[PDB]
Amino acid sequence: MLQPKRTKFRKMHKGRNRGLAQGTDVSFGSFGLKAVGRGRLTARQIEAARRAMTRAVKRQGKIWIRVFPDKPITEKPLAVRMGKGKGNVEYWVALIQPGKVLYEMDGVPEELAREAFKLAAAKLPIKTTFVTKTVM
Amino acid sequence: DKKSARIRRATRARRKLQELGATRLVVHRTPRHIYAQVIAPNGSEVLVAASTVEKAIAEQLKYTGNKDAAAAVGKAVAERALEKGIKDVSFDRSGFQYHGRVQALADAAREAGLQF
Amino acid sequence: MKKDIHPKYEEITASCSCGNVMKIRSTVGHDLNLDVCSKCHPFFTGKQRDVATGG
Amino acid sequence: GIREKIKLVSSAGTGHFYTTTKNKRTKPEKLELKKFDPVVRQHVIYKEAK
Amino acid sequence: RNGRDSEAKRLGVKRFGGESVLAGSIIVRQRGTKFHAGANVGCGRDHTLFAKADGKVKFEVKGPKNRKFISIEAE
Amino acid sequence: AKLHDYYKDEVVKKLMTEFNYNSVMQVPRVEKITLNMGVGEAIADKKLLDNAAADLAAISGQKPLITKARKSVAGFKIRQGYPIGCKVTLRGERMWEFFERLITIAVPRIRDFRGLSAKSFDGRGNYSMGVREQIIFPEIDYDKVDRVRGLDITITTTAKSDEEGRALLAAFDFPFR
RNA sequence: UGGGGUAUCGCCAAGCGGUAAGGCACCGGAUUCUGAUUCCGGCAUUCCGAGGUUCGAAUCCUCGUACCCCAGCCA
RNA sequence: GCCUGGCGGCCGUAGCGCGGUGGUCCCACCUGACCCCAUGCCGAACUCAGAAGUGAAACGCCGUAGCGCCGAUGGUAGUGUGGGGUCUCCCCAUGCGAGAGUAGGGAACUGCCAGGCA
RNA sequence: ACUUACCAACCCGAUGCAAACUGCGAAUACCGGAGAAUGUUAUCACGGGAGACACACGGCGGGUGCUAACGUCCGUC
RNA sequence: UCCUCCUAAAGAGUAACGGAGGAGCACGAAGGUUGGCUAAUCCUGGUCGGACAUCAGGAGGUUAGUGCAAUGGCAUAAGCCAGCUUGACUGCGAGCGUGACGGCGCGAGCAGGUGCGAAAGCAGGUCAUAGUGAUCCGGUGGUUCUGAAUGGAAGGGCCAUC
RNA sequence: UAGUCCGGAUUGGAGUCUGCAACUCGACUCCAUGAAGUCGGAAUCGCUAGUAAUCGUGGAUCAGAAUGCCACGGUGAAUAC
Questions:
Q1: Do C22 and F104 touch (CB under 8 A)?
Q2: Which PROSITE patterns does this one have (chain A)?
Q3: Cβ-defined contact of C46 to F101 (cutoff 8 Å)
Q4: Any domain includes E3
């Protein structure tokens, strides 16, 4: 599980998730798993999907996780009233918008990249698509 | 840098005199000349200027660039400045110590009638 | 230099065993007897006897 | 805190006093300040670090 | 462990550009010299900029550091 | 002034000959000679630094400037602005007189003298060396020493490269093993 | 789960931000036929683990660990 | 007209870096220091008396875009008002409209006074 | 002093994130000045009388909550 | 209770048992002025000397510093060093800011007297924003202002102050 | 009255002798070096008169190798209620 090594403040406000994404082209690799839905992704979903990919295209290839969590999500325990402070940091999510290339892959044929990205897009909560490295 | 150190020594009194809005007598000492010029309160335009590079001053001197030369320049700026209706200036020593021949120049400008 | 805060730095005359009579300024305040000078010191013969060891 | 309050009394014949604060521990010496005396109307020496 | 904040100090620009002032009027109550004093403007002890002559407020950008002066035009 | 005159004829001429300079002023000249004695054991004793100051007062012909600590570091148990060394900046006539005594009579009186290292240039020509005894100067009385106190010399010159400083210093014959 | 306390030589237990003190033990010598007792000498913990403040941390702060004590209620 | 010095406007299209050049005057380094004055040591700096020497450094000027800097048009984001949906987010009409990036521009421009040369 | 499938500072190239980051920066709002039309002075000051100081939902911007609540706390309509 | 940032929607203000931190002082120099100076860190060389105490040179640019939090400031320095000093003055104050009020804040200038500077000038505390407590009651010093027949005094007032 | 002209360990160099042969691993000599040690904690030992103490000499074993062993003499105590 991914999590920043050392923050600056422990608890972040909710804020909103509007507009489109910045990481949009397949930059590092050759094939990409790009988001279409909005959503947000916990570190467990990123790890689950990465294990599905790494298993699927065996220890050949090279995989880039282009998103990183760095946003702490706090929850209140059970049978605790409202108020009395902000909750506790339970997990860490990355906020996703439509357009984020969530993962990249290189060093495989396209048909294995289709296969691993299908296998791993079923571990994520957002609708997802397959993209290739377009040249300009 | 020696010149840049001098300018940052000058700057406080320069900006203060531009803030008050007084006509300033800017001096300038070089190892063989002294320069003196009276500058309007807008800072752009000069009125009076004398120095030891002028042959009207330089011919009657032994060596340009000592205290006698600077006293001659101060006398000259005071004379020309009184001829052009300027009476009351403020002395901009322009980053030099008020000690040597800038003191000689300014004392010589005060003897010959220029009010500061 | 300032006034008398500095030690008295008067010209003396040094003389070593090499026959090198040499007058210098030094604040000893006394004439000087030496052995080694820059002239006739075993520096080059010293380097030679240094290198000349093995066999 | 530790810093005490003192009265700087005037050296002229008036009773006029300024008042201030002194660290009594680190500065045990008395405090003499040529302040202004408005009854004499003149700058007189003031004494008495209490 | 939290739950405290100071009282709001009401800083900022009190008279804007072109706004006619009397002498003595505070123009920008502020905290450092975010705005510097220009012609006919004084800077108080807490970097409050106040109108030193009557006229109109003039916000400008001068000098080699692109500082934000505030002049007053005589009016 | 002996080595200053020797400079002004033969070292200026010699270095104008060796390097193909155009200007007569492009030649290296030695700017200053700083004598530092960074005592450091004066964290507990003041008379020790006073005796150090008397020794640099004797070796040069000037009062030394007792230097203070720039930062506080705890590795050596010091504190900000605590006096920890003393130095003399020799320049002008006294630079040449000290340089004459140094290369003439002080350097040969070094114990086990093999030569001064030629790789002790800081890249810009400026030499720096260290003596281990203050006894090697003829002024320090051997009967009046209490602590052995070396010091470090630094010849600061106007050469750009360090081979150019090899040339400048080596033209005073300045031993160089 | 919260609050408080402790962690320092093999064991029990002192430590004041600039040095680690005591007892039992252990090691060597001596007494003794030999062992216990006794006597003479010693040693000894860089202080639970990690990070930070400091010139400097066993000492101060924060976090984790391990063990104790108190509370965990009215319905 | 060209060059140099001073004081300004302007505040990176103006600054950096690389390369070339200048000293008759100017400037800078320089020469000396018992004096005016100065160094928590030192004429290094400050200061004074000078002018032998060099433009090496510095500074100015001329090139050079390697960089900094400026920067459209178009599109995108956002958004005021009115309306709509599948409504934690968007769409429509309409008004404003970036930031980044691209083409490109770009090694400044100028006022007063003073001196040197023609 | 001799080797090395391991990690890795700084620097450079490329990619993201930020309420408590900003070498950029809107719309709107706000303040000030001038002008036309419209409005039963709608404005300000002073004086008589109050009431009210439990608010609710709905849009938009947010905090908290689980972007849960016909939840809670603000800003604005 | 008070200070700083965010929430806070680009003027001000704005809530919650919302997210984070601090104060209840220090200073007679750490204030005033005049004159001067410019950091952190890293590299290289160098006696003890070491990763890091001093010296010299270079790179670097304020990543430093600011008596103590944070934000905004600061090179003309508000940072650092030295000389002389008491303006850390007294009476006022055009005009403003800010609060429901009590109150709080900024202030050119005027008068008297002063410090620094050759002078222009600057100085009514500190780079700014925290470092605090109304009234009553009472204590101390000054001032015939009052002083229950009258002259005093007691007590009260006023000014300073605890 | 000093770690000293005390003390001689240790170590470097140069040698002599014996012995086929001195590296492991002799003895002695010369030059140089010059530790520890300033009267010894608890405890412990020997000695009653030519004794203890102290000073030398010889021998056996043995080619060479004793500070040991076995002998020999010189000076020569104290104390025993």
A1: yes
A2: RIBOSOMAL_L16_1, RIBOSOMAL_L16_2
A3: no
A4: no
- Resolution, Å (one decimal): 3.4
Cite the beta strand spans of chain C per DSSP E. 10-15, 21-26, 32-33
Task: Dig out the tokens for B12 from the structure.
Answer: 């406080």
CA of residue E15 to C1' of nucleotide J72, angstroms: 20
CA separation (Å) from B51 to B7, B54, B57, F133?
A: 20, 6, 7, 58
| Residue numbers in E 3-62, CB below 7 Å of strand J | 3-14, 22-26, 29-34, 36, 42, 44-48, 50-52
Cα separation, D4 vs D18, in Å, equals: 14
**Beta-carbon neighbour count of residue B76 at 10 Å?**
23
Tokens (6 digits) for E6: 């100071």
Experiment type: cryo-EM
Nearest C-alpha of chain F: how many angstroms from C37? 5
Per the CB < 8 A criterion, the answer to whether B70 and B108 are in contact is yes
Point out the nucleotide closest to C1 (alpha carbon to C1′): H42
Distance CA D1, CA D23 (A): 10
Bases of chain I below 7 A from a protein C-beta are 14-21, 30-33, 61-69, 71-72
Cβ-based neighbours of F176, under 8 Å, separated by 6 or more: F115, F116, F118, F166, F169, F170
The domain total for chain B is: 1
How far: A19 CA to I56 C1' (Å)?
34
For chain E, strand residue ranges (E) read 12-13, 20-21, 26-29, 36-37, 41-43, 49-51, 55-62, 67-73
d(C-alpha B37, C-alpha B21), whole Å? 16
Domains in chain D, number: 1
Can you spell out the DSSP letters for A87-127?
A: -EEEEEEEE--TT-EEEEEESS-HHHHHHHHHHHHTSSSS-
Give the domain range for residue F99: 3-172
Provide the residue range defining the domain that includes D50: 1-50
Residues 6+ apart with CB under 8 A from B58: B52, B64
Q: Is residue E73 part of a domain?
A: yes
**Token digits of residue F141:** 């009385």
Token pair in block for residue A104: 């990249």
In whole angstroms, give the CA distance from residue B107 to residue E3: 67
Tell me which of C17, C27, C35 to substitute to probe the interface with F (most F C-beta atoms closer than 10 Å).
C27
Q: How many domains does chain E have?
A: 1
CATH superfamily of A21-136: Ribosomal protein L16/L10 (3.90.1170.10)
Asked if F38 is an interface residue toward chain C (Cβ–Cβ < 8 A), one would say: no
Asked if F104 contacts C36 with a C-beta cutoff of 8 angstroms, the reply is: no
Residue E5 forms part of a structural domain: no
Partner C contacted by F1 (CB < 8 A): no
Give the separation between CA A22 and CA A31, rounded to whole angstroms.
Answer: 17
- Looking up residue B20, the CATH number of its domain turns out to be 3.30.420.100
> Min CA distance, C21 vs chain F (Å)?
12
- b/e map B32-49, b = 16+ CB within 10 Å: ebbbbbbbeeeeeeebbb
Domain total of chain F: 1
Q: Which two tokens stand for residue B41?
A: 């309160």
Closest alpha carbon to C38 in C12, C18, C14: C18
